[PDB]
Amino acid sequence: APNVVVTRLTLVCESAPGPITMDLTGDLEALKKETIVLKEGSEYRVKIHFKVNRDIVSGLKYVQHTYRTGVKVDKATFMVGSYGPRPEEYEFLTPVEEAPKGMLARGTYHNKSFFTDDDKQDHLSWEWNLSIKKEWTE
Numbered sequence: 001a002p003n004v005v006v007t008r009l010t011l012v013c014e015s016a017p018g019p020i021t022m023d024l025t026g027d028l029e030a031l032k033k034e035t036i037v038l039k040e041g042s043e044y045r046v047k048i049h050f051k052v053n054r055d056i057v058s059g060l061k062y063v064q065h066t067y068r069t070g071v072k073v074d075k076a077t078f079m080v081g082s083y084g085p086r087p088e089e090y091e092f093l094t095p096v097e098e099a100p101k102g103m104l105a106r107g108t109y110h111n112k113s114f115f116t117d118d119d120k121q122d123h124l125s126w127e128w129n130l131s132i133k134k135e136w137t138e
């Protein structure tokens with residue numbers, strides 16, 4: 001088993017009608033068929049769940065690349081830091097952002113996420129889709 005195991009991504013959104021989360025331990029190809037819904041203008045944070053198994057790690061980084069068909073990438077990088085080994089998993093949260101809003105903000109966004117570090121180690125890379133909608137349901 002690897003030292004760092006990434007287990008879950010959660011969109012923390014207080015106004016959401018239900019949990020917005022994905023299991024990151026399964027078929028990664030299957031992850032794309034799953035789409036994740038955010039009402040336009042919602043305040044959210046991205047929460048990455050991960051386990052450290054054996055050794056202290058340093059320089060952890062979360063890298064998130066968002067694509068819309070035909071548009072240059074929208075990239076962000078987040079310092080995660082140093083973590084020691086323990087049975088319970090850790091939770092890193094980005095700062096709050098506001099999802100975009102308006103008719104032109106609606107649609108599906110294709111994300112590729114990297115959990116890595118300053119040693120460029122690929123702790124997990126995965127694609128997932130996000131859908132911005134006028135309301136939470138349709």
Ligand SMILES: O=C(CNC(=O)[C@@H]1CCNC1)N[C@H](c1ccc(-c2ccccc2)cc1)c1cccs1
Pocket residue numbers: 038044066067068071072073074097098099100109111130
């Ligand atoms: O809308 C913007 C830029 N403007 C803002 O971000 C301000 C910030 C405050 N209010 C609006 N980018 C778009 C985007 C949309 C959604 C996300 C996303 C991903 C992951 C989770 C949640 C959401 C990421 C980016 C585009 C990406 C690609 C082409 S356009």
